[PDB]
Amino acid sequence: HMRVRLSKTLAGILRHHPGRYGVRLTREGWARVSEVVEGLRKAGWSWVEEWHIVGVALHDPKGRYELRNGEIRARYGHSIPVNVEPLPGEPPPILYHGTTEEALPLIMERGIMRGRRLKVHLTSSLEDAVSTGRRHGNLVAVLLVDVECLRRRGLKVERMSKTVYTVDWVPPECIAEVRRESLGRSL
Ligand SMILES: Nc1ncnc2c1ncn2[C@@H]1O[C@H](COP(=O)(O)OP(=O)(O)OC[C@H]2O[C@H](OP(=O)(O)O)[C@H](O)[C@@H]2O)[C@@H](O)[C@H]1O
Ligand SMILES: [K+]
């Protein structure tokens, strides 16, 4: 059984559509693992028990998930209202946001915007930013974001996972540099 497939479904439950799987989240995003298990089994994940859900969280390379006795939440990525307490640590001076080349004109006009999610997501990993952009297209641009530019105008940059940070919005003036990574047809 591929952890990655169960993880993609679990993330959708914990970020976007918990009710579709019989789950109610707390205001801090916490689901009862027992409810997640039942909803998955009803959707055809006939082998899944608490052990497997807990394992998805423990083995996740990014720290997408958090566990405590009986419960699991996503640390970030939500489109439904939750308040997730940040992890300790200060943000680095530069963070990355991966996107597509086609989005650059509107990002330069309106800033990096949260879209359907509660926050803009930034990473300390250039390679992760590239993979994030590649979810949307083959011609990717990575924006280098000046974190002190965000902070000094009152935009808190919160650590959600070891490498993933959230902010309400990134003003275009805080984009320090644009790096391109391209796939597919050579230009
Ligand atoms: N002004 C503007 N005009 C036009 N387009 C604009 C724009 N501002 C931003 N955009 C783009 O609008 C898209 C929104 O798309 P999304 O909501 O999926 O955001 P995202 O791609 O950051 O991804 C979130 C996390 O979700 C995944 O995490 P996981 O692996 O699932 O854990 C990822 O890796 C991340 O961490 C992105 O292309 C933005 O650049
Ligand atoms: K923080």
UniProtKB/Swiss-Prot annotation:
Give the record's GO biological process terms.
tRNA splicing, via endonucleolytic cleavage and ligation
List UniProt keywords, sorted A-Z. NAD, Transferase
Which residues form each disulfide bond in the chain? Answer: none
Q: What is its EC number?
A: 2.7.1.-
Origin, by domain of life? Archaea
Molecular-function GO terms, alphabetical: NAD+ poly-ADP-ribosyltransferase activity; tRNA 2'-phosphotransferase activity
> Its family?
Belongs to the KptA/TPT1 family.
Purpose of the protein: Removes the 2'-phosphate from RNA via an intermediate in which the phosphate is ADP-ribosylated by NAD followed by a presumed transesterification to release the RNA and generate ADP-ribose 1''-2''-cyclic phosphate (APPR>P). May function as an ADP-ribosylase.
What's the protein name?
Probable RNA 2'-phosphotransferase
Q: Which organism is it from?
A: Aeropyrum pernix (strain ATCC 700893 / DSM 11879 / JCM 9820 / NBRC 100138 / K1)
